[PDB]
Design a binder for this molecule. Structure first.
Ligand SMILES: [Ca+2]
Length: 1278
């Protein structure tokens, strides 16, 4: 178990080059101590010991030289070596490696073994001091033995004696007249004189080829005797490759059972199917049924049987089916291989059929068989994800990989999109001009990706958008229960036309381009992560607000992420904005490489036009999802981030996450540092709409608003202070000039706001002579160094401005060693008065006086606790009225002719968005505690924090645990609303009348929540989620290619243009059917131009001429891989045609099923070799694999390709299956060379890969460390 009980909550300190550990108590630690799972030791002075042994109790414990952690070592004790484990026990009969990477083996007495030894059946050598010889020869006994580099085990090896290679075996004896290897893995042959042989050699009646170096060449084809010869993969022995290796002659399969097992009918009646095609788990209606295994009786429509009882795609599958069903008690357990004769396999299928009919009679059911078939099917690579090339790079990380659907009118016309499906039309690639680069958008994200490039689908997205912005009017005839603005989810993963469609809709219906008051009545945001999206959005007129990741990113590097090494606060300034960082001169740099922060705040007087934006520190999807899961992983609750977790599992993890977040130590493993300081900056910045995350205010798990966070009071104060004081111009500075700090420099950031009409440091009074400014403005000081101590001389200054000369200021918020104090009003806080120039001066030590109460002492000291790791001071002017409001109302006048919607100014800055949900909330324990019920009772609270818009979670009904194939995502099983089946169901009752809330409550709860926010003068934001939809219940057959997030075919995939069963069709009787397209006709009549205006990506306008009441594949770009297999849709290998039964004039079935004679096997004729598949058809223009694993290609004429004498064996193949195109090497018996070198008629050597294709223009490596190069023309330079 444990040598010492663990301790937590104490910091490590370093004194005089040594680590000390100080307890939670504040006590220095001596002796052996398990601290946070690591066993460590401190001597009597309290210093930590590293790379030395210490004696505690009966244990001799070594501690590591880097970490000081207890680990195994060997100590020379008195005269002798003795091994020790991590717990300090002398080891017996065990290997141990010491500090220097040497290995000993200690015996029963603890004494190391010396000399030659056999251990666990391994021969090893030890030097006279007991050390293990590794990676060298050694003359023990008469003999000479080589010992392996890591194991130290005896192995054959070669060395160069004099000038000639010699071979040494495992026993240390030289090798004479035999094959022997070397450590690398090369085989040589050594003659009677000991000397290695070269070239072509015949020994023991067999011929081997040794190259110039003497290496035995296996799986090597070439013309050695002026006649072809292929050298074996097993032993390298030469075969003439004249003998055919296929073991299956042409045989007829028809017999007495064929007419009985044939299909009753060739159509959808007698065959289970998808769009006419058949699947591996298809059941069919045979003409007759061998009831009970005795008597054949005509079948009744309900007597369905599995196709795999009677037919198989190939012999391998047949043999596997037989072996699998056998193991389940259905007959003699059989070891069948593809090599087993076809007659034998078919006979064995029938004894299994008989047994099947017996267990059907015995059980009076077929469900046991459904489960047996289903299980067997998943076993086969062609019918599972093994042929789907699961990958996790990029967005594939979420669900394991994507399939892009194709326009294929010949095979899958229902699924044809009518030449739509333009992928990756993100803002920067809206016109496809970056399709060949990484600037093509990652169109595929999650689930079923909707084709937003299709005009018809674009119209439907507008219908949905109308439905949300009139939700209340339509669903409750309540014109006060309507959403006011939107958030556009996943901007970079959809067609950017949607932004224009949304923008123009808002223009038409609300005149958002007419005034700031109209625009700001419908606050709308974008989830737009690309670093070039801000500038796009601004070119297109800011119809929705861009995020400002530049500021969120800098919070990450300078405050929020990591215990120690953080970027300086200097980086917030982006001094590069000005030429030569001339803060003195302030000349703007007109021509920089598109870099830096979106809005400069060094001296922002409102004089330069800037891009309007929202900003945040954290989000429901930023710094939440990963930490919450890392916490679960760290405590063994789940293994992987994509792992499925239950709600209970989430709750347990959440308890650790909370413990870490509130940790008094001040260290955070999963959670973010300095959130209060980050909000202090977020909430005082000019030219932004800040957004506040629910999960920084309340705890992210459990019930909605169940418990506030420790940050709540500080952030609540900042929010109320923002209403009272935050207006006017801004400045921002740091006691720093770059990455590195000079002697006095603290790297403390100073951010100031001046008051309503005050735009600069030196401005003394407003132009309009308003006095509002005097009691407004704010001062913020922040640091990222919890070990910050000022020099005695040093002074830190807030330039509150020449509009605030001689004024008294009081603290709103001040940090200290146990927390951050919050001062709710002037009387309770320390005051400090500004000088003649308007500066508040601060020293290492300060003596502040309260306005009436007392004298206060306060040090400018970095602190470390749960609320901060650094410094935070905020100061406000005393004398602020109780109802003082510094905000600017938005003006109804047409201020701008620029065409733009949003404008960054004091009015827009007066808004605050509250993102009011967390993805990790628990499900409501009762209807009364549902989020939207709570929001209604609590609307008041947010009015007083200055929230002007409430961003509600997506209200769409969760797809839940439903999972038709593939990886489920956390959105779905956590019911957060981002994963949904029905876009229009926002919590309606079941059709039987029973309640059916979402995670957030019923549809009435939502309308009440929205109204309540309007009664308190707040807007409601709808989450618009056009990228995807989950768990569609209806199957269709699509043509699919395996693709990465950008829709580019994976480099090494056979999955190209294959038929696949996907879940793409909606129920048709859901709320998408009720409300789909219903509002478009009214909209076209009222606002024609929306439907006549051309969209950029398509050159076309949106098309409301077709309505979408039911989703189906034709409106989709693709899906995450569904784990069904590349050939779950059944196909004949010979002709490559897929089976179908939809229309009687174009039926294709295996011939057995139509009571015709199916012949199968290889048959020679005067012209060449032919092959017939199990379904009875001739192989033409296709690759075919025999029962022994050999591959062949059959040409257009139906003949196996084979090399002729004196002619080039390399052939260029062009097939119906395009992926297989390439240069192949076929032997005289037609076998394809794979994973090996092949000589042409002229002596040039080429290499052919795992699948037989020639490899060109690359270096190729070998298991024995041999390197070769292949030229562009294919030849091997080597
Ligand atoms: Ca997409």
């Amino acid at each position: 178990s444990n040598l010492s009980d663990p301790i937590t909550g104490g910091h490590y300190e370093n004194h005089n080059g040594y680590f000390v550990y100080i307890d939670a108590s504040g006590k220095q630690v001596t002796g052996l101590q398990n601290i946070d799972g690591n066993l460590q030791y401190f001597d009597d002075n309290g210093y930590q010991v590293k790379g030395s042994f210490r004696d505690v109790n009966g244990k001799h414990i070594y501690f590591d030289s880097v970490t000081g952690k207890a680990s195994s070592n060997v100590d020379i004790v008195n005269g002798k070596a003795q091994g020790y484990d991590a717990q300090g026990n002398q080891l017996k009969k065990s290997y141990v490696a010491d500090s220097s990477g040497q290995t000993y083996y200690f015996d029963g007495n603890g004494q190391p073994l010396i000399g030659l030894q056999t251990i666990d059946g391994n021969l090893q050598y030890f030097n006279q001091q007991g050390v293990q010889i590794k990676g060298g020869f050694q003359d023990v006994n008469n003999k000479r033995i080589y010992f392996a580099p890591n194991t130290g085990n005896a192995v054959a090896n070669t060395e160069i004696i004099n000038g000639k290679l010699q071979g040494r075996d495992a026993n240390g004896n030289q090798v004479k007249n035999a094959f022997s290897k070397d450590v690398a893995g090369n085989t040589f042959y050594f003659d009677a004189n000991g000397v290695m042989l070269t070239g072509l050699q015949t020994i023991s009646g067999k011929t081997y080829y040794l190259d110039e170096q003497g290496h035995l060449r296996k799986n090597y084809a070439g013309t050695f005797n002026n006649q072809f010869m292929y050298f074996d993969a097993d032993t390298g022995a030469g075969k003439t490759a004249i003998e055919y290796q296929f073991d299956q002659g042409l045989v007829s399969q028809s017999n007495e059972n064929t007419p009985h097992n044939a299909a009753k009918s060739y159509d959808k009646s007698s065959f289970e199917n998808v769009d006419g095609y058949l699947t591996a788990d298809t059941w069919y209606r045979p003409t007759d049924i061998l009831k009970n295994g005795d008597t054949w009786t005509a079948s009744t429509e309900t007597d369905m049987r599995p196709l795999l009882m009677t037919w198989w795609p190939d012999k391998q599958t047949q043999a596997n089916y037989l072996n699998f069903m056998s193991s389940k008690g259905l007959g003699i357990t059989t070891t069948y291989t593809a090599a087993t004769s076809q007659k034998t396999l078919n006979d064995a299928a029938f004894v299994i059929q008989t047994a099947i009919e017996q267990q059907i009679s015995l059980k009076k059911s077929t469900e046991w068989l459904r489960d047996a078939i289903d299980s067997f099917v998943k076993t086969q690579a062609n019918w599972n994800k093994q042929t789907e090339d699961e990958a996790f790079d990029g967005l594939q990380w979420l669900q394991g990989g994507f399939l892009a659907y194709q326009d294929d009118s010949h095979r899958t016309p229902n699924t044809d999109s009518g030449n739509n499906r333009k992928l990756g039309r993100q803002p920067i690639n809206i016109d496809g001009s970056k399709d060949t680069t990484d600037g093509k958008g990652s169109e595929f994200l999650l689930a079923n990706d909707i084709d937003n490039s299709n005009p018809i689908v674009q119209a439907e997205q507008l219908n949905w958008l109308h439905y949300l912005m009139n939700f209340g009017s339509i669903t409750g005839n309540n014109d006060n229960a309507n959403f006011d603005g939107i958030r556009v989810d996943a901007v970079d993963n959809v067609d950017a036309d949607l932004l224009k469609i949304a923008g123009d809709y808002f223009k038409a219906l609300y005149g958002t381009d007419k005034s700031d008051a109209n625009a700001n009545k419908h606050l709308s945001i974008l989830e737009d992560w690309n670093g070039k999206d801000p500038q796009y959005v601004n070119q297109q007129g800011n119809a929705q607000l861009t995020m400002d990741y530049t500021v969120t990113s800098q919070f990450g590097n300078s405050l929020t992420h990591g215990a120690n090494n953080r970027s300086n606060m200097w980086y917030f300034l982006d001094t590069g904005y000005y030429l030569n960082g001339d803060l003195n001169k302030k000349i703007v740099d007109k021509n920089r490489p598109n870099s830096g922060t979106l809005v400069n705040r060094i001296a922002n007087s409102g004089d330069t036009k800037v891009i309007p934006n929202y900003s945040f520190v954290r989000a429901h999807d930023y710094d939440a999802q990963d930490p919450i899961r890392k916490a679960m992983i760290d405590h063994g609750i789940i293994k992987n981030m994509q792992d499925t977790f239950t709600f209970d599992q989430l709750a347990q993890g959440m308890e650790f996450y909370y413990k870490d977040q509130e940790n008094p130590s001040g260290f955070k493993k999963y959670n973010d540092y300095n959130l209060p300081s980050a909000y202090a900056m977020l909430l005082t910045n000019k030219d932004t709409v800040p957004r506040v995350y629910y999960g920084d205010m309340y705890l992210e798990g459990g019930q909605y608003m169940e418990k506030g966070t420790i940050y709540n009071p500080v952030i609540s104060a900042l929010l109320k202070a923002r209403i009272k004081y935050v207006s006017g111009g801004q400045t921002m500075a740091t006691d720093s000039s770059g990455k590195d700090l000079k002697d006095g420099e603290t790297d403390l950031l100073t951010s100031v706001r001046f008051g309503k009409g005050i735009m600069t440091s030196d401005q003394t009074t407003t132009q309009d002579n308003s006095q509002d400014y005097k009691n407004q403005g704010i001062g913020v000081i922040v640091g990222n160094n919890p070990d910050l101590k000022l020099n005695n001389d040093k002074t830190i200054t807030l330039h509150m401005g020449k509009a605030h000369k001689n004024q008294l200021y009081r603290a709103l918020v001040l940090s200290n060693d146990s927390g951050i104090d919050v001062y709710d009003s002037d009387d309770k806080a320390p005051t400090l008065r500004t000088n003649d120039n308007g500066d508040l001066i601060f020293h290492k030590t300060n003596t502040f006086v309260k306005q009436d109460g007392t004298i206060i002492n306060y040090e400018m000291k970095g602190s470390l606790n749960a609320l901060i790791s650094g410094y935070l001071g905020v100061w406000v002017p005393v004398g602020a009225s109780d109802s003082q409001d510094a905000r600017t109302v938005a003006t109804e006048s047409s201020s701008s002719n620029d065409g733009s919607v949003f404008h960054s100014n004091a009015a827009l800055d007066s808004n605050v968005i509250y993102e009011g949900f967390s993805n990790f909330q628990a499900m409501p324990t009762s209807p009364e505690q549902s989020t939207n019920v709570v929001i209604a009772t609590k609307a008041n609270l947010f009015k007083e924090l200055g929230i002007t818009s409430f961003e509600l979670a997506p209200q769409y009904r969760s797809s839940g645990d439903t999972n038709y194939g593939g990886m489920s995502f956390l959105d779905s099983f956590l019911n957060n609303g981002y994963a949904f089946t029905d876009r229009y169901d926002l919590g309606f009752n079941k059709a039987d009348g029973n309640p059916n809330p979402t995670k957030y409550g019923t549809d009435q709860d939502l309308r009440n929540a929205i109204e309540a926010l309007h009664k308190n003068g707040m807007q409601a934001i709808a989450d618009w989620v056009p990228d995807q939809i989950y768990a569609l219940p209806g199957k269709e057959v699509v043509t699919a290619t395996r693709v990465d997030e950008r829709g580019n075919q994976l480099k090494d995939t056979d999955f190209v243009n294959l038929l696949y069963v996907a879940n793409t069709k909606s129920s048709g009787v859901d709320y998408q059917a009720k409300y789909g397209g219903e509002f478009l006709d009214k909209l076209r009549e009222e606002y024609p131009s929306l439907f006549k205006q051309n969209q950029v990506s398509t050159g076309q306008p949106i098309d409301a001429s077709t309505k979408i009441k039911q989703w189906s594949a034709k409106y989709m770009n693709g899906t995450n891989i569904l784990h069904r297999g590349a050939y779950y849709v059944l196909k004949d290998w010979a002709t490559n045609q897929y089976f179908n039964i939809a229309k009687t004039n174009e039926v294709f079935l295996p011939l057995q099923l139509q009571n015709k004679d199916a012949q199968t096997g290889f048959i020679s004729d005067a012209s060449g070799v032919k092959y017939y598949s199990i379904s009875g058809y001739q192989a033409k223009d296709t690759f075919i694999e025999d029962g022994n694993g050999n591959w062949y290609y059959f040409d257009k004429d139906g003949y196996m390709v084979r090399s002729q004498q004196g002619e080039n064996p390399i052939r260029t193949v062009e097939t119906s299956v395009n992926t297989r195109n390439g240069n192949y090497y076929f032997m005289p018996n037609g076998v394809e060379l794979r994973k090996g070198f092949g000589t042409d008629n002229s002596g040039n050597v080429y290499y052919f890969d795992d699948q037989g294709k020639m490899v060109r223009d690359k270096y190729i490596n070998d298991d024995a460390n041999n390197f070769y190069h292949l030229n562009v023309d294919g030849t091997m330079s080597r």
